[PDB]
Amino acid sequence: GYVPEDGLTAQQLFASADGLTYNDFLILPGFIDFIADEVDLTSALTRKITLKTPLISSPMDTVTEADMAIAMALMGGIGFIHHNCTPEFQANEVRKVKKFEQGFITDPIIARTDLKKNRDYPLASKDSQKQLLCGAAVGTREDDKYRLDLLTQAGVDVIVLDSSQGNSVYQIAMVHYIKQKYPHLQVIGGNVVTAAQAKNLIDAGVDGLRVGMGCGSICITQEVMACGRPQGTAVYKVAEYARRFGVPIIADGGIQTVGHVVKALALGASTVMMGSLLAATTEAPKIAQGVSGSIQDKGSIQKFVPYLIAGIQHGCQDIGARSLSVLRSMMYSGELKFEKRTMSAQIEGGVHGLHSY
Amino acid sequence: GYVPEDGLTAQQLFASADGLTYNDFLILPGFIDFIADEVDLTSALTRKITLKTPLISSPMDTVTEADMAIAMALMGGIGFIHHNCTPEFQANEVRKVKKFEQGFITDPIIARTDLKKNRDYPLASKDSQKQLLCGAAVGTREDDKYRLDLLTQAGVDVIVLDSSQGNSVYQIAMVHYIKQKYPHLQVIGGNVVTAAQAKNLIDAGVDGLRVGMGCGSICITQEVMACGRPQGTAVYKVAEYARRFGVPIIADGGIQTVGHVVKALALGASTVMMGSLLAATTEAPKIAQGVSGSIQDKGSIQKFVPYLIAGIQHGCQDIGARSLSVLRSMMYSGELKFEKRTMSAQIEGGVHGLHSY
Amino acid sequence: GYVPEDGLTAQQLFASADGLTYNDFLILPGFIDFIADEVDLTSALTRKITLKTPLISSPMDTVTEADMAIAMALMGGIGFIHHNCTPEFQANEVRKVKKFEQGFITDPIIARTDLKKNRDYPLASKDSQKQLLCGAAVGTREDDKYRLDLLTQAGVDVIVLDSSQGNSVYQIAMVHYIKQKYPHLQVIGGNVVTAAQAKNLIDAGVDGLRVGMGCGSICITQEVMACGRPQGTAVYKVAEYARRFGVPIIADGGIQTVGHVVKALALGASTVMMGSLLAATTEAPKIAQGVSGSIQDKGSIQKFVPYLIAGIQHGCQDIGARSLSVLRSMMYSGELKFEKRTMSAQIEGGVHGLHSY
Amino acid sequence: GYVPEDGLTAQQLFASADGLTYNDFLILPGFIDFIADEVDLTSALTRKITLKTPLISSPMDTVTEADMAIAMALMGGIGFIHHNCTPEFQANEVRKVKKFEQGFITDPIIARTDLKKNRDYPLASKDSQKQLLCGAAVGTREDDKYRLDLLTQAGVDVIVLDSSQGNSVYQIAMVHYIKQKYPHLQVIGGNVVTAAQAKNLIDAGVDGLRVGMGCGSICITQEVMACGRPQGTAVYKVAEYARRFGVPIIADGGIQTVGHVVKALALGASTVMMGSLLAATTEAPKIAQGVSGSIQDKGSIQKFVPYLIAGIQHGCQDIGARSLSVLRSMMYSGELKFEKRTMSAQIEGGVHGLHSY
């Protein structure tokens, strides 16, 4: 009645200072004793918001403009309104997000079409009354403090502070300002990749952290600047540290299939920012450290996100985890076991042996 | 108030005999508490010359002929006049470099256009007289001793001794000859890659070393000869040794973006020789162990080098280093931390997931 | 419902090439669902004898002369008659062992006192009929071939070939001689310590091996000759090899408590030879690579061996092994777990903190 | 027909930088197919002397006066006459070694008692004549150059240069002097413990090396001076280097049993130098870095050295080595295998479990 324990526990992957990303490892399967589609996907975007689906849409002008934020909230995720735009435009934009369905309408009462929407979209993320949740990016420059006023009067729930570095005196100063002036506004950090720099943002009072820098599909920062972290290592090594204080970690960049979503959610992160996978769907709109564009068409979101939700929850089922909180327990108790891959051992992931596919 | 030490200190990368190059590692970010464009870039080229910008242009006929040496000096860097040419031509060439702007003109007084140039180009590298700095390559063969006379009477400041191996009895003999006959002329070694061979050139009296052999975009030496060193390991392991005596190390070859410049300067090198990145700009002109040519056009230098200077000093800011001397301190005190990458973990550096770019 | 695997599996101790011995490790406890004394203690002395208790008495003139061999057989173990004596004396000695109780007495019928002995000593080791089992040592010299005749006509069951080295051309030759001339006689090897030398004795046709050389309380061989093996490593590394062919391994020398008996029987050995622990009991009688004597009195055997049998079977109970065959299964399946000790971690074995004991 | 490789090869012990001595390891036994006492025990002492036994008596006032040097040469070994005495006494002393038995007596012819001695002592080490071999120590202070004259006119064959450090400019100078003035005199370098310092003595033209410093029973030096090696590591690491050029290695100090003689010769020394094991035999005679004396009576040397010769050659037989040249052939081919001892596996060398011994 004894059987050896195959594979590294989570801490034993990252005990070698080796720089793994999501491609470099696998999760060992475990005992299925539950039906394929009853696992619970609720995850925290900050200490005080739960989303009924862990998928976030990245604050960039190519992805979330006016309608991605609507759909992601109907689908129990969220969006962050971009900010390479005039502040009045962005504020009007989050306003036309918040008003899309309502409980007690204050500045047009109730309605019946809104209740039909409530019946049709059961996962929808709704704050209070019945309106949709929405976030936005705000910059770090001094003149962007004006934008907070328009956003606040426009009913935004949460904000990211956008900059490629989170551990700067300016971003900390901005977190202090927001947290002393607008105590109902939850704020989210700036692309951290190490526990020693997540500390300063946590002490400032940041209510959730997005993690990863210079790893991404449209993003060239590492290969032009030297700073970065292999983002599958980053998401574990910082969520190990942020879990002590309770702030959630949102995985950010390089997520280019469902497998990478499941790996990020097994390693510790609470939710995931999709960029270039959600870009070029139906409803998407002095040195240079970015890339121009060109993502191919990817259909309609309302038929796309359910595929992501079915894939992610099939992965959780076959790993053996009855919910995402159980998946993080199996991770931190050492019950999940992982295997490395040699470069060559990745090719038998369906890549070769066919004339076309 | 305790947080772990994420990543290898500098010495712990190269403690494994593993052959790293600039692609194989990343630098962990650190605290920004200074503005992005005030970090000091002054770097030594020999024990007795400082450049106001760490960028050098490689002595080859495809890069620096007559005008690259002018521009690099105006931009606070330098050039070395190539030497696959008749000695009189090369001497006339460094002469037409020195005369481009002047203090007291001896063999035409002063001028006003020269002072306008002084106002327009504030970084320019100059003698005590307002004339530009210039170096030259000189060969190792006996008959090339004649070239030293023309170069000396032509007002050259410094020389490289060209050959692909520096640790030869002939190059040492040539360093002794120059240092006993022309004591004002600073001399630079021949492409060393190990402390045990930098010793002989240092004892001869070499005033700076270029480091790296058979690693560089146009050079096939390793793949036809067996001798060489992974050049990111070479620059550290030899600058660890040369720092004791004070001679500068200049990193040489394979620098094909700004990230490689920042990595080379973080590892110990004082300055960097650009070849094929500066080749094919506006102002650029029995076995065979080199490659034919064909580099695409790269615009004008006066608008190109400032991009390099902005990128490099952005990298230094985000690492947290207030100057290049502070960057080398954070390196040798073990305060900089580095991560390895698997081959697979390099691909998420913006390479893939796009239809075109 | 997950809990880590504390301690090294058996193979993970001896995969470190560091020369462990019984003092230098511990066995981790395991689940008990059975009473202290039900565990089955039967073990094989050769491929074709089972003993109802695993203790053997060492063939030396200080231990087994005439009565130790009687008692050990009454107690379900065995003895080997010594051989530093005249062959006629030894043969008469094993004869006066075999005759001590009988079935059909051939050369005096049956008796009633013999059946009373059969009632009183239920563990007693007996061949066909009801006589006691007995072994003897025989030498390796040519003139000792005569002794085999007297021993054979005297009714010995099994023999050891005595020499301190087993892997010699002479011992192999002697095994062949005995196995072609007396096919009923089982023969036992000469103090082997490596699989590469157990091979030759196994191929000769040896039916069990005694393992260990130059480790033992009276034995100085290592400290005067250089040859040997740390005997707790020896017993595992050779029983890992002999188990393939089926021959049993008997652990030999350095057993100075019950803990060492249990450790030897966990590591693979089937039975154990006791020398200086059974020496100086009530019923015990050109270079020099041995020691003179002086073992203090140790009482009567009939009250001593049951203490050994209670201790050994208590150790098996607390490890959780329901029999000695289950204990070897838990060993080779990797279910037993072991811990090393630093030198400094052995003193807390009841040695210190007391004025007297 | 396959069986694993039990134990470390020779190079795999000392690849761990952990400072083993003779007590810290064992040699694995091997196949015997030869009789106990036929193994060829000849060894080189310098490039141009063979001894019919590897034991040497150490140059000290408590071991080597003429009575010892005689008895060792009769027993096929040697002695080095001590040198803390007046030069005339030492010269007279080696003269009374040489004259003890003769071929053609020049300054009294032949004799019959000398031929009786030749019949009685068959192993005796002798010149090209029949007179016994003798070495001596000579110092390295300049006034000791006088002693070389008396020793040379007295017929000494070989000399050690005695000083506790061999790698000094003075000992090198003395080797050059002797080798240019007295080319028939073989000279032995003093107490080296590293290949990097044996090089200078071999380049000076030393004809054999004494190896070990600060390890030895009367010698306190490591515990007073900081310099030294674990002498079982030193004898391997230096014989590995000296074997390239052909100079013999004599293992000096810490030899306190026959096992240590066999271990030194397995590790690659040609001969072994005995102090305290021969001190107090019947015919043995400003900082302090030595100990006073007090060694107990060791009996008569003609009945003692045959016990060393039987033990050393029994050890070789059981390792399986048919001669000492075969023992060093099995060493450097990696055919000998060694086991480390944990501290708690040395006690089992017959030390414990007895009331007296």
Ligand SMILES: NC(=O)c1ccc[n+]([C@@H]2O[C@H](COP(=O)([O-])OP(=O)(O)OC[C@H]3O[C@@H](n4cnc5c(N)ncnc54)[C@H](O)[C@@H]3O)[C@@H](O)[C@H]2O)c1
């Ligand atoms: N879409 C996203 O999620 C995302 C993520 C990262 C970066 N970005 C974008 O990347 C682009 C490149 O810029 P970046 O983000 O790398 O750096 P940035 O433009 O935020 O900042 C550039 C430099 O200026 C400094 N700076 C910023 N605010 C400052 C202030 N108030 N006072 C003084 N200095 C200040 C920063 O510390 C940094 O050193 C920007 O357009 C940004 O919006 C977007």
Ligand SMILES: NC(=O)c1ccc[n+]([C@@H]2O[C@H](COP(=O)([O-])OP(=O)(O)OC[C@H]3O[C@@H](n4cnc5c(N)ncnc54)[C@H](O)[C@@H]3O)[C@@H](O)[C@H]2O)c1
């Ligand atoms: N652009 C550069 O920085 C750069 C760097 C290396 C080589 N090169 C060029 O590549 C070509 C080959 O150069 P190389 O350095 O590989 O070899 P080289 O042409 O300098 O030397 C060729 C051979 O001659 C030997 N040699 C050189 N000088 C000698 C002397 N005075 N006396 C005796 N032997 C001598 C060398 O050891 C070598 O075996 C040359 O045209 C050189 O200018 C240019």
Ligand SMILES: NC(=O)c1ccc[n+]([C@@H]2O[C@H](COP(=O)([O-])OP(=O)(O)OC[C@H]3O[C@@H](n4cnc5c(N)ncnc54)[C@H](O)[C@@H]3O)[C@@H](O)[C@H]2O)c1
């Ligand atoms: N009590 C025991 O279980 C036990 C165990 C080991 C040794 N011993 C005793 O140790 C004592 C010391 O001797 P030992 O056993 O170490 O070695 P041994 O007496 O078996 O052999 C001594 C030498 O003779 C050689 N030899 C043995 N038989 C030979 C033959 N037929 N032909 C030629 N050469 C032969 C061996 O190779 C060895 O060199 C002996 O009295 C022996 O009985 C007893």
Ligand SMILES: NC(=O)c1ccc[n+]([C@@H]2O[C@H](COP(=O)([O-])OP(=O)(O)OC[C@H]3O[C@@H](n4cnc5c(N)ncnc54)[C@H](O)[C@@H]3O)[C@@H](O)[C@H]2O)c1
């Ligand atoms: N019995 C032995 O085989 C044995 C082995 C080693 C040392 N010793 C003894 O140890 C004792 C302590 O002395 P030691 O051997 O440690 O060192 P030492 O007395 O030989 O030398 C002491 C110092 O004087 C230096 N010295 C030697 N010759 C010199 C010269 N010509 N000019 C200048 N300096 C010179 C040495 O290099 C050293 O630094 C001596 O009596 C020596 O004989 C004996």
Ligand SMILES: O=c1[nH]cnc2c1ncn2[C@@H]1O[C@H](COP(=O)(O)O)[C@@H](O)[C@H]1O
């Ligand atoms: O210009 C840029 N600088 C820094 N980060 C960027 C930039 N553009 C995109 N990103 C990152 O790219 C992520 C989108 O995921 P991706 O499509 O997998 O790369 C965003 O959430 C950002 O973290």
Ligand SMILES: O=c1[nH]cnc2c1ncn2[C@@H]1O[C@H](COP(=O)(O)O)[C@@H](O)[C@H]1O
């Ligand atoms: O023919 C050659 N042999 C050896 N080294 C060369 C040769 N041509 C160029 N180099 C090296 O190539 C470096 C430039 O490399 P790059 O910047 O990658 O193009 C120069 O500074 C030289 O060190």
Ligand SMILES: O=c1[nH]cnc2c1ncn2[C@@H]1O[C@H](COP(=O)(O)O)[C@@H](O)[C@H]1O
């Ligand atoms: O003289 C001897 N030489 C070699 N081995 C011996 C000698 N005497 C006893 N032994 C070994 O010592 C073992 C008993 O060790 P003990 O139980 O610790 O006393 C015996 O079974 C033999 O293997």
Ligand SMILES: O=c1[nH]cnc2c1ncn2[C@@H]1O[C@H](COP(=O)(O)O)[C@@H](O)[C@H]1O
């Ligand atoms: O005063 C001393 N200084 C250094 N070495 C010494 C001194 N006296 C004796 N020796 C060494 O002490 C060792 C004693 O040899 P052992 O008695 O066989 O261990 C030999 O190697 C001697 O060369």
